[PDB]
C-alpha cells in the first residue's frame, strides 16, 4: 500500500473534513496500486507563535510531505504563515499557500519553501498595465505605501512601463502607519496628469481617500485607479465613487483552493515517487536540524506541475516565486456599491455590456491630462 502524508492548516473544522474529502477523491483519482495518500491536519492559531509549534508538534511531527496553509480571511492573519514558512523552510518542506497575498512571500528568493495557488497583490500591477492598454491612460501618478508590498507593487509596474516610452509623471510614497497624508497629496494635486494609482493597505488607503476628498480631488476629470484591498474593509468605506478597484476571482474561496492543492500535490507526489533515488522526509521538529534531499526536488517538481480543469481555473506557477495566472474581475463603484464592469482573463481585459460611471458622477470617460 505505502503511505505518504500531506500536512494541512485551514480556517474552521469545517475545512478539515473539506481537506480530508479531497485526499479521498484524488485517491479515487490516482491509480493507488503503487502508493496511497493519507490526510494529516490541524486548525490555525491567531497568535503566530503557537502556529509554528502546531506545525512542529502536530504536523512536521508526522514525516509530512507538504503543509497546506490557509486561515481566517481577515488582513491581520496574512502573517500567520510567516512562522509556518520558517518552520517548513528550515527543512525545505513545500509550503502551499491557499489564500495569502502579501508579496514578501512570492518575493525573489526569500521564502525558499513557499508555494501558492493565489497570485499576489504585486501582479495586479500587470492588470493596471492592461487598464492603461485599453482606455488610453497616458499620464499617471503613482502613490504607494513605503513597505515590502508597495515597492514590489510599484517596481513590477515600472518594469512593464520601462519598455514603453513612459513611466509615472511623478511616483509618490508615504508612511505605512501615517494617519496624516494632507501634506503629500498637495503636490500630488498640483500636477499635470489626472488619473492617480494606489497600492496601499485598507487603513493607509482609507486615510488618503477621505484626505483627498477633504482636499478636493474626487470628481471632475480625475480618475482613481486601484486594486483589491484598496477596496476591502476600511478602504472603500472612505473611498470615492468612480474608482476601479480590482478583485481576485475566488480569492477568498478556501474550499475551492484546497481542492486544487491536493490534486496538484497528488499530480506531484506521483511525479516524485516514480523517480529512482527518492528520500524519506525528516521525522520530528525537536533536535532535528537537517533537510531531506528530496525537499527542493519535490518543490522543483511542485513549481513545474500543470493541472487542467482545477476550480479556480487552471493551476500553473511561474519562475520568480510560484504563483498562478488566474482571471481577475474589474470592479466599479456606483452609489456605495461595487458592481463589475469587465473581466481581465489570464492575459487581457474583455468588457461586458454594463456601462461605467466615472468620478464626480461622470457619464463620459475622462482623459487624465489636466482638463
Amino acid at each position, epitope marked *: 500500500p505505502k503511505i505518504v502524508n500531506i500536512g494541512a492548516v485551514l480556517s474552521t473544522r469545517k475545512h478539515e473534513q473539506m481537506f480530508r474529502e479531497a485526499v479521498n477523491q484524488a485517491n479515487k483519482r490516482h491509480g493507488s496500486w503503487k502508493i496511497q495518500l493519507n490526510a494529516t491536519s490541524v486548525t490555525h492559531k491567531p497568535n503566530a507563535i503557537q502556529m509554528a509549534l502546531s506545525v512542529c508538534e502536530d504536523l512536521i511531527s508526522s514525516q509530512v510531505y507538504a503543509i497546506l496553509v490557509s486561515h481566517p480571511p481577515t488582513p491581520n492573519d496574512h502573517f500567520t504563515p510567516t512562522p509556518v514558512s520558517y518552520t517548513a523552510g528550515f527543512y525545505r518542506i513545500p509550503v502551499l499557500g491557499l489564500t495569502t497575498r502579501m508579496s514578501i512571500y512570492s518575493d525573489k528568493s526569500i521564502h525558499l519553501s513557499f508555494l501558492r495557488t493565489v497570485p499576489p497583490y504585486s501582479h495586479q500591477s500587470s492588470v493596471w498595465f492592461e487598464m492603461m492598454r485599453v482606455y488610453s491612460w497616458n499620464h499617471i501618478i503613482l502613490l504607494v505605501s513605503d513597505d515590502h508590498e508597495g515597492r514590489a507593487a510599484q517596481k513590477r509596474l515600472e518594469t512593464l512601463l520601462e519598455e514603453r516610452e513612459s513611466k509615472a509623471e511623478k511616483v509618490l510614497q508615504f508612511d505605512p502607519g501615517t494617519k496624516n497624508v494632507t501634506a503629500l497629496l498637495m503636490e500630488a494635486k498640483e500636477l499635470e496628469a489626472r488619473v492617480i494609482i494606489l497600492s496601499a493597505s485598507e487603513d493607509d488607503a482609507a486615510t488618503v481617500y477621505r484626505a483627498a476628498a477633504m482636499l478636493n480631488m474626487t470628481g471632475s476629470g480625475y480618475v482613481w485607479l486601484v486594486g483589491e484591498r484598496e477596496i476591502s474593509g476600511n478602504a472603500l468605506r472612505y473611498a470615492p465613487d468612480g474608482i476601479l478597484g480590482l478583485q481576485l476571482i475566488n480569492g477568498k474561496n478556501e474550499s475551492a483552493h484546497i481542492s486544487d492543492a491536493v490534486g496538484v500535490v497528488a499530480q506531484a507526489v506521483h511525479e516524485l515517487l516514480e523517480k529512482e533515488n527518492i528520500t524519506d522526509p525528516p521525522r520530528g521538529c525537536v533536535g532535528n536540524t537537517n533537510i531531506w534531499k528530496t525537499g527542493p526536488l519535490f518543490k522543483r517538481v511542485l513549481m513545474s506541475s500543470k493541472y487542467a480543469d482545477g476550480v479556480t481555473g487552471r493551476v500553473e506557477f511561474n519562475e520568480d516565486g510560484d504563483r498562478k495566472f488566474a482571471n481577475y474581475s474589474i470592479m466599479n463603484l456606483q452609489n456605495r*456599491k461595487l458592481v463589475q464592469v469587465g473581466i481581465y482573463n489570464g492575459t487581457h481585459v474583455i468588457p461586458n455590456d454594463r456601462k461605467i*460611471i466615472w468620478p464626480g*458622477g461622470e457619464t463620459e470617460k475622462p482623459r487624465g491630462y489636466q482638463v
Partner: antibody
Amino acid sequence: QVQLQESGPGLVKPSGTLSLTCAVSGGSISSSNWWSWVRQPPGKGLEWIGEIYHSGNTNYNPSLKSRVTVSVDKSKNQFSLKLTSVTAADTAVYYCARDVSGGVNWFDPWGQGTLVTVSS
Amino acid sequence: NFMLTQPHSVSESPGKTVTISCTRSSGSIASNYVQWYQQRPGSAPTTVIYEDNQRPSGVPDRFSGSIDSSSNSASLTISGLKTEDEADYYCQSYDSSTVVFGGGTKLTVLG
C-alpha cells in the same frame, strides 16, 4: 426647494405588472443625484428596490434583480418604476425619493406615496 | 446583504432621554454611513439624522446619533422627550450589494 410626486395608487392582478411613475419639481434630473424607489407592505417596515442615474445607468436589489426596471425622461423631468410578476406579498405603499449622492445612500426629499393594491 | 435589527417597541417618559439600537449582523457598523428616519403615521418618511450623526436645519439638538463600534450598533438618542416624539423610527445603512433598512421601532411616550 426640490419636490417629487408619483403616479396613481391602483389595482394590479396576480402575476402582473407594477406601473409607477414620478415627476420631479423645483429642480432637475441631470443634477448629480440618483433617482430611486422604496416600498412598505402595510403594518411593516421599509424595503429598497433600485436606482437610475441621469444617464440611464441602473442598479437593482439582489432579492429582486430579475423583476425590476427603472427608466427616465429628460424632457418632462420625470422618471418611472416597473415591477413585474407580482403576488400577495407585493401589496404595499410605493415611494420614489431623491438619493442625495456624493458618497452615501440618503433619501431626501421622499415621494408622497401610493398604494399598489395587488388583487383580483 | 446584512439585516439591521431594532427594538420592536421602545418607550420613555416626557422630558427624559431614550435610546434606539440599530444592530447590524455582518460587516462593521461604522464602516458604512447610518441614517435615521421618523415615519409619521399616515405620512411619508423624513430624515432626522444624516451621516451617522449629521443633523438637518429645523430638526432640533434633542435629535442626535452615535455609532457603537464595539456593539456593532448605531444609536438614535432623543433627550427632553416631548409628546411629538411619539412616532415610528428607522435606521438605514447600506453595503456593496444593497440599501438596507431596520425592522423599525415603535416609540410610545410613557405617561
